Design an enzyme around this catalytic site. Sequence first.
Site, PDB file in Angstrom:
ATOM      1  N   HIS A   1      19.007 -15.190  -0.644  1.00  0.00           N
ATOM      2  CA  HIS A   1      20.093 -15.323   0.316  1.00  0.00           C
ATOM      3  C   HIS A   1      19.738 -14.648   1.643  1.00  0.00           C
ATOM      4  O   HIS A   1      20.358 -13.674   2.052  1.00  0.00           O
ATOM      5  CB  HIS A   1      21.390 -14.782  -0.285  1.00  0.00           C
ATOM      6  CG  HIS A   1      21.897 -15.580  -1.447  1.00  0.00           C
ATOM      7  ND1 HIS A   1      21.863 -15.114  -2.743  1.00  0.00           N
ATOM      8  CD2 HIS A   1      22.443 -16.818  -1.510  1.00  0.00           C
ATOM      9  CE1 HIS A   1      22.362 -16.029  -3.555  1.00  0.00           C
ATOM     10  NE2 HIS A   1      22.730 -17.069  -2.831  1.00  0.00           N
TER      11      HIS A   1
ATOM     12  N   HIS B   1      17.016 -19.159   4.064  1.00  0.00           N
ATOM     13  CA  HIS B   1      18.102 -19.934   3.471  1.00  0.00           C
ATOM     14  C   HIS B   1      19.082 -20.413   4.555  1.00  0.00           C
ATOM     15  O   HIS B   1      19.354 -21.616   4.675  1.00  0.00           O
ATOM     16  CB  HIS B   1      18.797 -19.088   2.402  1.00  0.00           C
ATOM     17  CG  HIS B   1      20.055 -19.691   1.861  1.00  0.00           C
ATOM     18  ND1 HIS B   1      20.060 -20.795   1.034  1.00  0.00           N
ATOM     19  CD2 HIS B   1      21.351 -19.335   2.021  1.00  0.00           C
ATOM     20  CE1 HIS B   1      21.305 -21.097   0.718  1.00  0.00           C
ATOM     21  NE2 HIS B   1      22.109 -20.230   1.308  1.00  0.00           N
TER      22      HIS B   1
ATOM     23  N   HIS C   1      26.694 -18.507   7.049  1.00  0.00           N
ATOM     24  CA  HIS C   1      27.456 -18.612   5.796  1.00  0.00           C
ATOM     25  C   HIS C   1      27.108 -17.566   4.729  1.00  0.00           C
ATOM     26  O   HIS C   1      27.889 -17.345   3.814  1.00  0.00           O
ATOM     27  CB  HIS C   1      27.356 -20.024   5.201  1.00  0.00           C
ATOM     28  CG  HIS C   1      26.211 -20.195   4.253  1.00  0.00           C
ATOM     29  ND1 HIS C   1      24.899 -20.207   4.669  1.00  0.00           N
ATOM     30  CD2 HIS C   1      26.180 -20.317   2.905  1.00  0.00           C
ATOM     31  CE1 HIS C   1      24.110 -20.341   3.617  1.00  0.00           C
ATOM     32  NE2 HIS C   1      24.862 -20.405   2.533  1.00  0.00           N
ATOM     33  N   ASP C   2      25.933 -16.945   4.832  1.00  0.00           N
ATOM     34  CA  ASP C   2      25.531 -15.913   3.870  1.00  0.00           C
ATOM     35  C   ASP C   2      25.282 -14.531   4.486  1.00  0.00           C
ATOM     36  O   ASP C   2      24.712 -13.660   3.820  1.00  0.00           O
ATOM     37  CB  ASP C   2      24.306 -16.366   3.053  1.00  0.00           C
ATOM     38  CG  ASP C   2      24.681 -17.016   1.711  1.00  0.00           C
ATOM     39  OD1 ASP C   2      25.772 -16.755   1.169  1.00  0.00           O
ATOM     40  OD2 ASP C   2      23.867 -17.787   1.187  1.00  0.00           O
TER      41      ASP C   2
ATOM     42  N   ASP D   1      24.254 -25.973   1.364  1.00  0.00           N
ATOM     43  CA  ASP D   1      23.953 -24.784   0.608  1.00  0.00           C
ATOM     44  C   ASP D   1      22.943 -24.977  -0.511  1.00  0.00           C
ATOM     45  O   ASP D   1      22.038 -24.152  -0.687  1.00  0.00           O
ATOM     46  CB  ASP D   1      25.236 -24.208   0.033  1.00  0.00           C
ATOM     47  CG  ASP D   1      25.143 -22.725  -0.190  1.00  0.00           C
ATOM     48  OD1 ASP D   1      26.013 -22.215  -0.904  1.00  0.00           O
ATOM     49  OD2 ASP D   1      24.212 -22.081   0.354  1.00  0.00           O
TER      50      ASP D   1
ATOM     51  N   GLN E   1      18.235 -25.127 -15.377  1.00  0.00           N
ATOM     52  CA  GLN E   1      18.188 -25.926 -14.163  1.00  0.00           C
ATOM     53  C   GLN E   1      18.791 -27.317 -14.384  1.00  0.00           C
ATOM     54  O   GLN E   1      19.646 -27.761 -13.616  1.00  0.00           O
ATOM     55  CB  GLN E   1      16.747 -26.018 -13.669  1.00  0.00           C
ATOM     56  CG  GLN E   1      16.259 -24.750 -12.996  1.00  0.00           C
ATOM     57  CD  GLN E   1      16.774 -24.625 -11.585  1.00  0.00           C
ATOM     58  OE1 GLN E   1      16.969 -25.629 -10.896  1.00  0.00           O
ATOM     59  NE2 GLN E   1      17.000 -23.396 -11.139  1.00  0.00           N
TER      60      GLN E   1
END
Length: 328
Positions: A78, A82, A116-117, A227, A279
């Site tokens: 993050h 990213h 956003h992070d 995202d 995953q």
Amino acid sequence: TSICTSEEWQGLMQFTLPVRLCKEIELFHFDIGPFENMWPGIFVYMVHRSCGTSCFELEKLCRFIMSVKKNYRRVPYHNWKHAVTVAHCMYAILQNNHTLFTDLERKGLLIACLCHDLDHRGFSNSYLQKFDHPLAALYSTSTMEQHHFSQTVSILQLEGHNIFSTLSSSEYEQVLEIIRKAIIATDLALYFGNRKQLEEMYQTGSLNLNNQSHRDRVIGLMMTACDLCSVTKLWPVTKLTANDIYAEFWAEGDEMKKLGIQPIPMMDRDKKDEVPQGQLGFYNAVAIPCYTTLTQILPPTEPLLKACRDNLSQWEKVIRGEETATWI
Ligand SMILES: c1cnc2cc(OCc3ccc4ccccc4n3)ccc2c1
Ligand code: NI
Ligand code: NI
């Protein structure tokens, strides 16, 4: 909150994007990875082709960008990479669907993605509430997401950072709300309901982008798509990025053991064998449906869905023992 240094925004004003990249940046599958030095430049270029050279006071724009870079912590996932990666996916979305959204929406959404992070510590919402961190007391749902927003406004309220002054007083309210809603929707908790609502609206015909409540939800799913977009790259990129996310997940998992709570398997480095099946389920439960619904809603986003399908099949391939190469 911290500030950027002297020649960082000055050297960036001198930056110009090479020819080959100009035509590659427009693509969905494009990967910013091989070009770290050019990241802040890619973002400026992205803002200028999307909403114009006079979309922001250049001087403020750079001060802002570089201050966003400094407020991303050196976590394995993050992080600044990213941020810029998700912003680029937004650019590709907006370019393929330009006239659908406003000049305020586009500048709001590019800024939201980049921000956003902000100030992520490599810990999940689950973590912060289970161990009553102050952020969980301050923010009772969507804990980190609400913090990222707060961080965005705080950065905006710095000297010569406010890129949204020249707009209005009402327009200032509007864009922040767009950014607030956009960031909040990157809480995957909200994603499930949102996608299912959007899916029902599409299959009944009731969806209307002129409906402000429908607009918010479409924008929401757009944010999720951006995202998660590491899972829309070419297979080896996708694989590489998975390493980074687990480095983050497992370090959290390490913290829970120290306080005598056996962590979820996803965060348990001694459960590496479960990665491919894990995953798979994420693709089946989260990513596929996301890009599937987003394609129905915005047909030019199909390449995202297409690449995501290729990677599911790649993970299916790993499960059957057909894995090749496997560099780290
Ligand atoms: C962005 C990108 N990728 C994501 C992948 C996620 O799940 C992967 C996962 C799930 C369960 C697992 C269980 C055991 C081991 C690894 C496991 N691995 C969950 C959230 C994600 C968000
Ligand atoms: Ni987040
Ligand atoms: Ni994110």
